[PDB]
Amino acid sequence: RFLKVKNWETDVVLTDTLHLKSTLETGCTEHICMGSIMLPVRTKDQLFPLAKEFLDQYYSSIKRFGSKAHMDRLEEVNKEIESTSTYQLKDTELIYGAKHAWRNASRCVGRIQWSKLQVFDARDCTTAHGMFNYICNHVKYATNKGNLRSAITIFPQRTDGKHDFRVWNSQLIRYAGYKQPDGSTLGDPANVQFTEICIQQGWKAPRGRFDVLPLLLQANGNDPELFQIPPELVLEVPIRHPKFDWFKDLGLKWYGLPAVSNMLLEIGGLEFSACPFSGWYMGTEIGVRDYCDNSRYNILEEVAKKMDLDMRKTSSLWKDQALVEINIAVLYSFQSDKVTIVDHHSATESFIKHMENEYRCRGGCPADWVWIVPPMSGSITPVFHQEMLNYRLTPSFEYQPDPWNTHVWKG
Amino acid sequence: RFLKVKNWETDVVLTDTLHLKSTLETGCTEHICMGSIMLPTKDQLFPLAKEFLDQYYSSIKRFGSKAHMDRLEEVNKEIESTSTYQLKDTELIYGAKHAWRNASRCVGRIQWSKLQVFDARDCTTAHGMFNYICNHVKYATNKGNLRSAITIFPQRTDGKHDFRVWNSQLIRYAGYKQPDGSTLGDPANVQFTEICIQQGWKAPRGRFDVLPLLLQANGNDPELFQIPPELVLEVPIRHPKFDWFKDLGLKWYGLPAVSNMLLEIGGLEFSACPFSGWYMGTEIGVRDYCDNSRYNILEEVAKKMDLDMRKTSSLWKDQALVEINIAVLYSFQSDKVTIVDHHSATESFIKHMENEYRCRGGCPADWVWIVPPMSGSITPVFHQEMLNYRLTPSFEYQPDPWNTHVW
Numbered sequence: 001r002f003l004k005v006k007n008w009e010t011d012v013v014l015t016d017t018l019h020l021k022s023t024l025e026t027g028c029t030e031h032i033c034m035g036s037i038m039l040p041v042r043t044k045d046q047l048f049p050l051a052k053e054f055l056d057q058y059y060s061s062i063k064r065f066g067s068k069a070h071m072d073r074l075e076e077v078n079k080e081i082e083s084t085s086t087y088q089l090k091d092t093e094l095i096y097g098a099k100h101a102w103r104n105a106s107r108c109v110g111r112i113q114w115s116k117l118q119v120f121d122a123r124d125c126t127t128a129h130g131m132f133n134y135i136c137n138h139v140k141y142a143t144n145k146g147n148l149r150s151a152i153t154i155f156p157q158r159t160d161g162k163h164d165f166r167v168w169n170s171q172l173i174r175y176a177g178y179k180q181p182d183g184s185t186l187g188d189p190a191n192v193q194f195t196e197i198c199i200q201q202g203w204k205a206p207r208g209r210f211d212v213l214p215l216l217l218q219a220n221g222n223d224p225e226l227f228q229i230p231p232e233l234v235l236e237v238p239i240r241h242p243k244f245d246w247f248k249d250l251g252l253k254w255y256g257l258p259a260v261s262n263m264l265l266e267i268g269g270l271e272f273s274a275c276p277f278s279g280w281y282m283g284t285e286i287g288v289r290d291y292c293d294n295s296r297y298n299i300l301e302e303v304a305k306k307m308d309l310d311m312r313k314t315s316s317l318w319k320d321q322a323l324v325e326i327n328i329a330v331l332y333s334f335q336s337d338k339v340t341i342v343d344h345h346s347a348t349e350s351f352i353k354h355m356e357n358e359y360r361c362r363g364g365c366p367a368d369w370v371w372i373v374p375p376m377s378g379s380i381t382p383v384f385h386q387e388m389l390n391y392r393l394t395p396s397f398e399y400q401p402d403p404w405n406t407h408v409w410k411g
Numbered sequence: 412r413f414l415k416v417k418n419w420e421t422d423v424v425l426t427d428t429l430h431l432k433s434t435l436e437t438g439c440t441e442h443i444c445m446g447s448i449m450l451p452t453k454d455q456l457f458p459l460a461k462e463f464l465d466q467y468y469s470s471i472k473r474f475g476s477k478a479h480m481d482r483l484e485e486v487n488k489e490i491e492s493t494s495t496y497q498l499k500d501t502e503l504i505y506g507a508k509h510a511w512r513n514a515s516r517c518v519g520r521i522q523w524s525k526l527q528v529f530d531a532r533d534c535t536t537a538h539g540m541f542n543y544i545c546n547h548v549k550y551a552t553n554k555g556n557l558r559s560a561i562t563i564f565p566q567r568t569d570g571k572h573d574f575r576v577w578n579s580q581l582i583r584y585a586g587y588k589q590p591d592g593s594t595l596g597d598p599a600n601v602q603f604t605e606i607c608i609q610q611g612w613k614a615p616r617g618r619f620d621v622l623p624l625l626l627q628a629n630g631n632d633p634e635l636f637q638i639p640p641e642l643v644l645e646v647p648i649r650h651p652k653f654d655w656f657k658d659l660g661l662k663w664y665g666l667p668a669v670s671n672m673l674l675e676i677g678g679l680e681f682s683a684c685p686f687s688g689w690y691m692g693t694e695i696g697v698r699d700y701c702d703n704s705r706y707n708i709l710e711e712v713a714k715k716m717d718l719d720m721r722k723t724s725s726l727w728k729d730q731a732l733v734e735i736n737i738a739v740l741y742s743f744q745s746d747k748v749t750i751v752d753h754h755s756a757t758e759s760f761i762k763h764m765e766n767e768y769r770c771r772g773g774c775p776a777d778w779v780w781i782v783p784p785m786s787g788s789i790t791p792v793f794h795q796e797m798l799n800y801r802l803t804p805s806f807e808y809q810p811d812p813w814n815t816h817v818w
C-alpha cells in the first residue's frame with residue numbers, strides 16, 4: 001500500500017511507503033484520533049525477534065544484508081540471548097541505533113542534523129560518580145564554547161528492571177523552582193517537584209530565580225546521589241533586546257545547552273533508561289514556552305507593562321506584541337554572544353527540505369504536526385501547510401515514568 | 412476506553428463518554444495517525460433515520476413515547492414506499508444545530524444553539540435560490556451586528572437533481588492570472604473566477620471584486636447572479652497607529668458564509684446548505700492576508716514599517732503579522748461589525764468544552780484546526796488535549812461541482 005501527503009502552499013505531493021515498517025501503536029483507532037494527547041522486565045520470548053529486526057536493518061544500511069558477517073552476528077546474538085537472556089550491541093550497532101532513534105523521532109523538528117550525532121559510549125559506567133564524570137564530559141563537548149555540537153551519552157542497558165541507570169533530572173541543565181508560602185513561585189514552576197526532591201536529598205538551595213539545579217544520578221538501581229555541575233561548564237546568556245534598553249533590567253537569562261535526560265532509548269529490544277542527549281535551541285522554546293507559558297516564568301504581563309501597551313482588552317493583541325519582542329530579544333542575545341540558536345523560520349524550512357529528502361531516499365518521514373508547528377506564527381512557517389503522517393518506528397526514544405514514582409528506596 | 416483529556420496549563424481533567432456514540436471513521440488506524448491530513452439504498456437509510464430520531468426524541472424527553480414510536484413507524488413506512496423521507500421542521504432545526512455542535516474543526520461552537528435556520532426546501536429554481544441567499548445575507552449581516560444562520564435547500568434524491576452553490580463562500584473576492592505571471596486579487600479563487608468569466612461574467616479585474624453567485628437548482632446548469640452591493644458589508648482596513656496603513660488599499664467583507672459543504676441529517680443529504688457566523692480576526696489577518704498562496708502582503712507591510720528584512724531571525728514577519736491583525740480587529744470594531752479576536756474565541760471554546768463535557772459527556776475537537784494560526788501557545792486551547800471523532804448530524808466536504816457536473 002501507498003499513502004499520499006500534500007503541502008497546500010506548494011501543492012507538492014509525496015508518497016509514503018515507510019509506514020509499512022511501522023510496528024508499534026499510535027493510540028488512535030478507526031473511530032477516535034488521539035493526535036493531540038501528550039502521552040497516549042522484558043523476557044527471552046520477544047527479545048530475539050526484536051534483535052533480528054534491528055540487525056536486518058543495520059546490515060541493510062551497511063549494504064551487507066545476507067552476508068556472512070550478517071548471518072554470523074544473528075547467530076551470535078541468538079546464542080547470547082539463550083545463554084544470558086540478553087545481549088550486548090557492538091559499538092557500530094550502538095551508534096547506528098542512537099542516530100536512528102533521533103531520525104525516527106516524529107516530534108523533533110531538528111532532524112535534518114540526525115546523521116551528525118556524537119555518540120558517547122558509557123556502558124562501562126558502574127557508579128553515580130562515574131555518571132557525573134561522563135555527563136560533565138558531555139556538557140563540555142556539546143557546549144564547545146558556544147559552538148554547539150549534538151551529542152548523546154549512553155549508560156548501561158536495563159537488565160532485570162531492578163538495576164536501572166537513571167538521570168533523575170528532566171534536562172541536564174535546568175533552573176530550580178520554589179513554591180512560596182503565599183502560593184507564588186520563585187524560579188521555574190515546571191521544576192518545583194524535582195527541586196523539592198533535591199533539597200530533601202541535601203541540596204543547599206540558593207533560592208534565586210535562576211539557580212542551576214544539581215544532578216541527581218542513579219547507577220545500577222541504587223539510591224540517587226547529588227552532584228553540582230562545575231559552573232564554568234554551564235554556559236548562560238543574559239537576555240537583552242536590541243532596541244529596548246530596559247529589557248536587560250528584567251534580569252532574564254537562559255542556559256545555552258538543552259539536554260533532555262529523562263527519556264528511554266530502545267535499540268533492538270534493548271532498553272537504555274539513561275541516555276541524555278543534546279542539540280541546540282530553537283528560539284521559541286525559550287522565548288515562547290519557557291518565558292511566556294502561564295505555568296512557566298510567565299513574563300508577558302511585566303514585559304507588556306514596560307512597553308506601555310493597552311493591556312485592558314485582549315483585542316489590542318498586547319500579548320502577541322510582547323511575545324514577538326521577547327523572542328527577538330532571545331535570538332539577539334544568543335547570536336550576540338555567539339551561542340548556537342536557530343529561529344523558527346529557518347528551522348521549519350530546513351525540516352521541510354529534510355522531510356522531502358527522507359521521502360525520496362527513505363520512503364517517508366514520520367512527523368507529528370502538533371509538535372512540529374512552532375508555538376507562535378504557525379501559518380507563516382511552511383510546516384503549517386504540510387500534511388504529515390505520524391507513526392512509530394524503532395530504534396526509538398520513548399517516555400518513561402519519573403523515577404521517584406517507581407524507585408524502591410534502599411535507605 | 413472511557414477516555415480522559417487533560418489541560419496541561421490548568422491541570423483540569425475531563426472524562427469523555429460521548430465518543431462511544433461515534434459512527435463514521437477518522438482515517439486513523441492503530442498504526443498511523445492522519446490527524447494533519449486535510450481531507451481524510453433503502454436498507455442503508457432506515458438505520459440512519461432511526462439513530463437520528465432516537466437522539467431527537469431523547470433530546471425532547473420523549474424517548475420511548477408513543478409519539479416517538481409513531482414517528483419511527485411513519486418514517487419507516489415512508490422510506491419503504493418512497494425510498495426516502497422528509498424531516499419535520501422541528502427535526503430539521505435540531506439536526507442543523509447539532510451538525511454545527513458536532514463540527515470538530517469549529518472554534519465558535521459555544522454559540523451552537525442560537526442558529527437561525529431558514530427552510531428553503533420549497534425552492535425549485537436558481538432564481539429562487541438567489542432570493543433565499545439574498546435574504547440570508549441580509550438577515551445574517553444585520554447592519555454589522557451579525558447573526559448566525561443557515562439556509563437549507565432541497566435534499567438529494569437520486570444525485571442527478573442536486574442543488575449546489577458553486578461558490579465556496581457566498582462572498583469572496585475574484586482572482587486573476589496576470590500576463591506578467593503574477594496574480595491579481597485572491598489566488599485561491601483563480602479557477603472559480605475563470606469559470607464565472609467562462610459563464611459570461613464581466614470582471615472589473617480589480618484587487619477586491621466581489622464574485623457573482625453561480626447557483627445550481629435541481630441538477631440544471633448553474634446560473635450567475637450579482638449580490639446587491641448594498642447587501643455586501645465591507646470594512647476598509649486601517650491601523651490605529653500607522654497612518655500609512657490605509658494607503659495599502661486593503662478591505663475585507665464582514666460575512667463569512669461557507670457554501671460548499673454537505674449537511675447530513677438522519678441519512679438525508681443536503682448538498683446546498685450555505686451557513687454563516689462571524690469572523691475570528693486571524694482568519695483574515697493571518698490566513699487571507701499573509702499566506703504565501705493568498706494575498707501575501709507580509710513584505711509590503713514590513714517595508715512600510717522599515718523592518719530589517721535581511722535575516723529571518725529579526726522576526727520581521729512576526730512583527731508585521733501582529734500589526735496587521737491589530738489593524739483588522741481595529742477596523743471591524745471601529746465600523747461596528749462583529750469580529751472576535753483569537754484570545755477571546757479560544758477562551759470561550761474552553762468554556763464550551765467544559766459545558767459539553769458536563770452536560771453531554773464530551774466534545775469532539777480537532778486540535779490542528781482549533782489552535783489559531785498565530786500565537787498558538789499563548790491561547791488556552793494549545794494546552795488542551797482534545798479527542799477527535801465523528802458524530803452525526805454532520806457537515807461534510809463534497810467535490811467541487813465543476814469536476815462532476817454533466818453539462
Ligand code: HEM
Nearest residue numbers: 102105107108109110113150152277278279280281282397
Ligand atoms: C540539533 C538541534 C535540535 C533542534 C533544533 C531540535 C528541536 C526540537 C524541538 C523544538 C522539539 C520540541 C521540544 C519541546 O517543545 O519540548 C524537539 C523534540 C525532540 N527532539 Fe529534537 N532538536 C534537536 C536535536 C535533537 C537531538 C540531538 C535529539 C536526540 C539525539 C533529538 C530528539 C528529540 C526527541 C526524542 C524529541 C521529542 C521530545 C518530547 O517528546 O518531549 N533532538 N526537538
Ligand code: HEM
Nearest residue numbers: 511514516517518519522559561686687688689690691806
Ligand atoms: C458564529 C461564529 C463562528 C466562529 C467564530 C467560527 C469559527 C470558525 C473557524 C475559525 C473555523 C476554521 C475555519 C478556517 O480556518 O477555514 C471554523 C470552521 C468551521 N465552522 Fe465555524 N465559526 C462560527 C460559526 C459557525 C456556524 C454558524 C457553523 C454552521 C452552522 C459553523 C461550522 C463550521 C464548520 C463545519 C467548520 C469546518 C470548516 C472546514 O472544514 O473547512 N461555524 N469555524
Ligand SMILES: C[C@H](O)[C@H](O)[C@H]1CNc2nc(N)[nH]c(=O)c2N1
Nearest residue numbers: 036037038370371793794795796
Ligand atoms: C495538548 C497538546 O498536545 C500539548 O499542549 C502539546 C502541543 N504541542 C506541543 N509542541 C511542542 N513542540 N511542545 C509541546 O510541549 C507541545 N505541547
Ligand SMILES: C[C@H](O)[C@H](O)[C@H]1CNc2nc(N)[nH]c(=O)c2N1
Nearest residue numbers: 384385386387447448449779780
Ligand atoms: C496541512 C494542515 O492540515 C493544514 O494546513 C491545516 C492546518 N490547520 C488548519 N486550521 C484551520 N483553522 N484552518 C486551516 O485551513 C488549517 N489548515
Ligand SMILES: N=C(CS)NCCC[C@H](N)C(=O)O
Nearest residue numbers: 258260278279280281285286
Ligand atoms: N531543543 C532540544 C534538543 S535537545 N530540546 C528540547 C527541549 C528543551 C525545552 N523545549 C526547553 O525549552 O527548555
Ligand SMILES: N=C(CS)NCCC[C@H](N)C(=O)O
Nearest residue numbers: 667668669687688689694695
Ligand atoms: N468563520 C466561519 C464561519 S462561516 N467560516 C470560516 C471560513 C472563512 C475563511 N476562514 C476566511 O477567512 O474567509
Ligand SMILES: [Zn+2]
Nearest residue numbers: 028033439444
Ligand atoms: Zn490520529
